[PDB]
Amino acid sequence: GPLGSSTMGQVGRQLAIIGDDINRRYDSEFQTMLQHLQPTAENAYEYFTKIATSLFESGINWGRVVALLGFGYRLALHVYQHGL
Amino acid sequence: GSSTMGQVGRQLAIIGDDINRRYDSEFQTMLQHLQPTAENAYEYFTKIATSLFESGINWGRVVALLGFGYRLALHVYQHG
Ligand SMILES: CCCCCCCCOCCOCCOCCOCCO
Ligand SMILES: CCCCCCCCOCCOCCOCCOCCO
Numbered sequence: 594g595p596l597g598s599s600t601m602g603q604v605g606r607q608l609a610i611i612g613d614d615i616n617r618r619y620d621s622e623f624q625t626m627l628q629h630l631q632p633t634a635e636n637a638y639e640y641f642t643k644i645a646t647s648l649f650e651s652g653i654n655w656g657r658v659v660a661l662l663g664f665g666y667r668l669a670l671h672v673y674q675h676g677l
Numbered sequence: 678g679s680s681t682m683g684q685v686g687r688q689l690a691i692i693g694d695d696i697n698r699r700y701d702s703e704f705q706t707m708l709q710h711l712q713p714t715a716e717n718a719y720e721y722f723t724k725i726a727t728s729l730f731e732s733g734i735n736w737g738r739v740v741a742l743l744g745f746g747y748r749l750a751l752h753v754y755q756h757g
């Protein structure tokens with residue numbers, strides 16, 4: 594097919610490499626952070642928003658936003674798996 | 678401040694800054710190879726995403742795509 598030889602296909606595979614590297618570098622770190630926070634459904638929103646406010650206090654860039662999104666995803670998984 | 682949420686927020690700022698410096702130059706080269714414009718940005722993003730998720734999906738791939746999509750939009754804006 595034409596996708597994989599196009600520049601768009603190539604960039605998609607480069608983003609796979611980068612996204613897998615983000616996952617390897619930080620997934621377990623996020624889990625450790627969340628095990629220390631012990632979020633539940635009762636405090637997940639308040640924890641996430643206060644963390645976000647501190648995060649962006651010193652600035653915003655796309656790396657910080659995607660760190661927050663990945664941490665938030667892991668936070669939602671933590672709340673789900675412990676509220677079962 | 679005194680809060681643990683502040684402590685966590687600063688650890689995430691460290692991680693986010695590391696992500697930004699680790700990959701933004703790679704994003705830049707990718708954007709220079711793509712030469713995106715206002716007319717083809719949606720097409721390029723859609724096709725990049727198709728290529729990306731063909732080989733699997735996890736949160737790191739999803740957020741990498743979202744960060745690249747933001748940088749694609751910023752590139753088009755700055756250069757035009
Ligand atoms: C305003 C002109 C003079 C004041 C400069 C003093 C600051 C020099 O040190 C900068 C270190 O700041 C690190 C950032 O810390 C958090 C920033 O959050 C506030 C957003 O501006
Ligand atoms: C020249 C005097 C210094 C003035 C700089 C003020 C910067 C305020 O904005 C900071 C927002 O940026 C977020 C933090 O930057 C992270 C740097 O490392 C990220 C790698 O790209």
Ligand SMILES: CCCCCCCCOCCOCCOCCOCCO
Nearest residue numbers: 653654655658659697698701743744747
């Ligand atoms: C869909 C999630 C992505 C949203 C990200 C928003 C990021 C906002 O940051 C704006 C400030 O950044 C200034 C320029 O950013 C790119 C510069 O990169 C150079 C490396 O330091």
